[PDB]
Amino acid sequence: NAMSDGTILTIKRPITVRAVVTPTWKEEAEREISNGIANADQQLAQLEQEGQTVVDQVRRQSANPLDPRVQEQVANIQQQVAGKRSELEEQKRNLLQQQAQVRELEMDQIVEQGQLESSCEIKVGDNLVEKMQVAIVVRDGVIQSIEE
Amino acid sequence: AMSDGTILTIKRPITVRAVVTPTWKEEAEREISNGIANADQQLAQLEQEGQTVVDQVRRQSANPLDPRVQEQVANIQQQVAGKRSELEEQKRNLLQQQAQVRELEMDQIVEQGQLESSCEIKVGDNLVEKMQVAIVVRDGVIQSIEE
Amino acid sequence: SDGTILTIKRPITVRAVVTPTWKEEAEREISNGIANADQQLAQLEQEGQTVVDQVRRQSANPLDPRVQEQVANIQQQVAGKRSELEEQKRNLLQQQAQVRELEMDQIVEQGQLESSCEIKVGDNLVEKMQVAIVVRDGVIQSIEE
Amino acid sequence: NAMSDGTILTIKRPITVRAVVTPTWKEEAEREISNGIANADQQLAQLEQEGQTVVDQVRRQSANPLDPRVQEQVANIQQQVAGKRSELEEQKRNLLQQQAQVRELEMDQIVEQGQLESSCEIKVGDNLVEKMQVAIVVRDGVIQSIEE
DSSP string of B110-125, one letter each residue: EEEEEEEE--EE-TT-
**What subunits touch chain A, counting only 3 or more CB pairs under 8 A?**
B, D
Count of alpha carbons within 13 Å of A80, Cβ hemisphere only? 12
The H or E element spanning position B34 is helix B22-59
Return the closest-CA partner of residue A61 out of B104, B79, D73, B66: D73
Residue-by-residue DSSP string for A45-70: HHHHHHHHHHHHHHHTT-S-TT-HHH
User: How close does chain A come to D70, measured CA to CA in Å?
Assistant: 9
User: How close does chain C come to B122, measured CA to CA in Å?
Assistant: 7
Domains (range + CATH), chain C:
1-145 (6.10.140.1110)
**In whole angstroms, what separates CA C137 from the centre of its chain?**
22
The H or E element spanning position C118 is strand C107-119
Distances (CA, A) of D140 to D11, D21, D26, D75, D143: 29, 9, 10, 51, 9
CB C67 within 8 A of CB C59: yes
Q: Do B142 and A124 touch (CB under 8 A)?
A: yes
Chain C contacts of D119, Cβ < 8 Å? 7, 116
Mutate to test the interface with C, among D24, D76, D118 (most CBs of C within 10 A): D118
CA-to-CA distance for A141 and D133, rounded, in angstroms? 12
Q: Do A5 and B145 touch (CB under 8 A)?
A: yes
Query: Can you tell me whether residue A104 is helix, strand or coil?
Result: coil
CA-to-CA distance for A95 and D134, rounded, in angstroms? 31
User: From the CB of residue A127, how many other CB atoms can be counted at a distance below 10 Å?
Assistant: 14
- Length of chain B counted residue by residue: 147
Return the closest-CA partner of residue A110 out of A136, A84, A73: A136
Distance in angstroms between the alpha carbons of the first and the last residue of chain B: 39
**H-type alpha helices, chain C:** 20-56, 65-101, 125-128
Residue-by-residue DSSP string for C39-70: HHHHHHHHHHHHHHHHHHTS-S-TT-HHHHHH
The H or E element spanning position C139 is strand C139-144
**In whole angstroms, what separates CA C51 from the centre of its chain?**
31
CB D55 within 8 A of CB D77: yes
CA-to-CA distance for C124 and C129, rounded, in angstroms? 9
Buried b (16+ CB within 10 A) or exposed e, B61-88: beeeeeeebeebbeebeeebeeeeeebe
**Experimental method of this PDB entry:** X-ray
- Length of chain D counted residue by residue: 148
CA-to-CA distance for C139 and B129, rounded, in angstroms? 9
Return the closest-CA partner of residue D61 out of B126, A81, C68: C68
Q: What does this entry list as its resolution, in Å?
A: 2.8
Chains A and C contact (Cβ–Cβ under 8 Å for 3 or more pairs): no
Nearest to A72 among B72, B142, B146 (CB): B72
- Which residues, other chains included, contact C50 with Cβ-Cβ below 8 Å and sequence gap of 6+? none
CB B16 within 8 A of CB B109: no
User: How close does chain B come to A117, measured CA to CA in Å?
Assistant: 11
Return the closest-CA partner of residue C99 out of C14, C36, C18, C16: C18
Segments of chain A assigned E as strands: 9-20, 110-122, 135-139, 142-147
User: From the CB of residue C129, how many other CB atoms can be counted at a distance below 10 Å?
Assistant: 19
**In whole angstroms, what separates CA B46 from the centre of its chain?**
20
Return the closest-CA partner of residue C116 out of C7, C24, C40: C7
CA-to-CA distance for B137 and D129, rounded, in angstroms? 36
Distances (CA, A) of A6 to A121, B115, C130: 12, 19, 34
Residue-by-residue DSSP string for chain D: ----TT--EEEEEEEEEEEE--HHHHHHHHHHHHHHHHHHHHHHHHHHHHHHHHHHHHHHTSS-TT-HHHHHHHHHHHHHHHHHHHHHHHHHHHHHHHHHHHHT--TT-EEEEEEEEEEEEE-TT-BHHHHTT-EEEEETTEEEEE--
Burial of residue D58 (number of CB atoms within 10 Å: 0-12, 13-18, 19+): buried
Question: What value, to the nearest 5°, has the Cα angle with vertex B66 and ends B60 and B68?
Answer: 85
Query: Can you tell me whether residue B75 is helix, strand or coil?
Result: helix
